[PDB]
Amino acid sequence: SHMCDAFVGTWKLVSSENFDDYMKEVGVGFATRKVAGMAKPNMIISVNGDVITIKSESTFKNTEISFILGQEFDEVTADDRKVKSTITLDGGVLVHVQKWDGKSTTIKRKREDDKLVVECVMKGVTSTRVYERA
């Protein structure tokens, strides 16, 4: 058993709060905000050795990242930003920092009860997205 066991599985979005305002703060344009805001993604997390994979599948876009903790990688986000990402484990929370254009956003993923809680922060703006097992 190991590092991210409690994250692994297939998860479905059940609630979102403040996501439009997070996207605005990130710089996402009107049409993408509207369409992306409607999506109810499935997030699929798996681990093979040191490599963690997080897939998001939805009507808007499918994305996939594979990474080693602490090791920077290039990511194309659902909204089409070209970012440089680093993901670490900090006290049982996956902490994902994305850098692009002199800007930065941090996404935290944590297990709380039977949920996977995703908190997205851009300057002073936080969005909380809650997932349940699919």
Ligand SMILES: O=C(O)[C@H]1CCCC[C@H]1COc1ccccc1
């Ligand atoms: O819900 C999540 O896991 C978060 C991850 C961090 C970026 C914001 C969210 C993803 O947002 C998406 C919206 C529409 C389609 C695909 C992803």
